[PDB]
Symmetry: none
Subunit: 139 residues, 4 copies
């Protein structure tokens, strides 16, 4: 099964998460989990008026990481699935508020907050993977 | 609580419903429940190659109705909520295959098929009610 | 070069048409030309508060009468063949389209967007968000 | 007249830029200019298969080094003030933007869409699908 995510709906969910993160003055910055958290981080940064945005990039190999234990930061990823990355991010940024747009059951309790529940066996098709394209009639 | 529906996602769900209605040759036509079923009916008509599209318009007042008992027709509405319209449509078109995009719990068993479950206390905001508009930052 | 219509652009055009059709109270209803008129009729029906929506399917099926007090809506007037049939059977309807090409534009009462006769046009119901492979597979 | 960028148009432009940046293998990473560069960087990172994405926040925070082997991306070069700071601290980066106005266009290595200096531009992260009352309340 597929769960399709359009740009406008990703933004609806990210703005709903931003509303939950008010007031903005409680936060020092946002750390995006690359790559999935980049677009959500841009939306949160806009809504919260936060210009201090950093990244964490992991494959376990750390390609690049934001310094510190996450105190006063939001850490955002697009999805928590099995929770592999999530377990590592908690360990690296134990004082951050860790949030995602989507959560599958296995990696629901590994984040502090998320917007939308997705079943475990469903592939989430994010809008950066798609284009509006002619489709032949199903007939 | 709100459930926002964009044009692209309405179309994703309607194309998924059309796939379930294959093969197209089993159907004589589509009857749209006005107004909500008009856009879904246009998408099904395109996907199934069906040019015989009619309407049923109810407020109980019948403004206009398609003739017959629905044999070989799909009857489509956008949502089944409490099931008021749905009870009347079954009664008027008892041989139709009655389908919706969305179903709330109260009016899930009043249709033959639907795509997406919506909680009873959630207002569905359809894309014909919205425009892409500047929004002030939440901050 | 393909002229691609998005859902949101179609709705912008249909709302511009709806504004011209005010006051809404003057209309008995809307007749959609199947299939291209169905989505534009849905938008007009929302904007004008009109629940009486019927269809004409070219004749497979038609709304009765001469069209007096009705809006008849299509997506596009191209060659004018459909338009010719609509003016014949609904001579007193207000016949409108979202898009018009020159060959057919004399046959409609109003349109929103004119396009060149040669335009290759695709409507939003012909397209969908679809996976596309990344430009690099690395 | 407002120049409104949709999400899907921004992605079309960013994919056109990504194609110019092939082969992807030549890059160490992407540096996003916060905040306007974050969404374009996400799209480039997908299209180019690049997981090393860093940020510069004007200095609140910066990616280290002189930029050699990096793409630096912003949404818009307007007056050129940010661009001036980026060429100073990342002189060996390939500095690109989606949109450019003339005042700033000499300061970037590449851009996709030029617009007039006076353009009132709104990006997709400034807008959202929002209820609007029907034109008739009937």
């Amino acid at each position: 099964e597929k769960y399709v995510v359009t740009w406008d709906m990703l933004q609806i969910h990210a703005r709903k998460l931003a509303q939950r993160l008010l007031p903005a003055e409680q936060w020092k910055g946002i750390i995006a989990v690359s790559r999935g958290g980049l677009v959500p981080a841009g939306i949160l940064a806009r809504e919260l008026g936060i210009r201090y945005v950093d990244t964490v990039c992991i494959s376990l190999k750390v390609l690049k990481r934001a310094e510190g234990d996450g105190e006063g930061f939001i850490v955002i990823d697009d999805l928590v699935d099995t929770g592999g990355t999530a377990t590592a991010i908690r360990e690296m940024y134990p004082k951050a508020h860790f949030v995602t747009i989507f959560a599958k059951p296995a990696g629901r309790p590994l984040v502090d907050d998320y917007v939308v529940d997705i079943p475990q066996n469903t592939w989430i098709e994010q809008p950066w993977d798609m284009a509006v394209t002619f489709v032949a009639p199903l007939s």
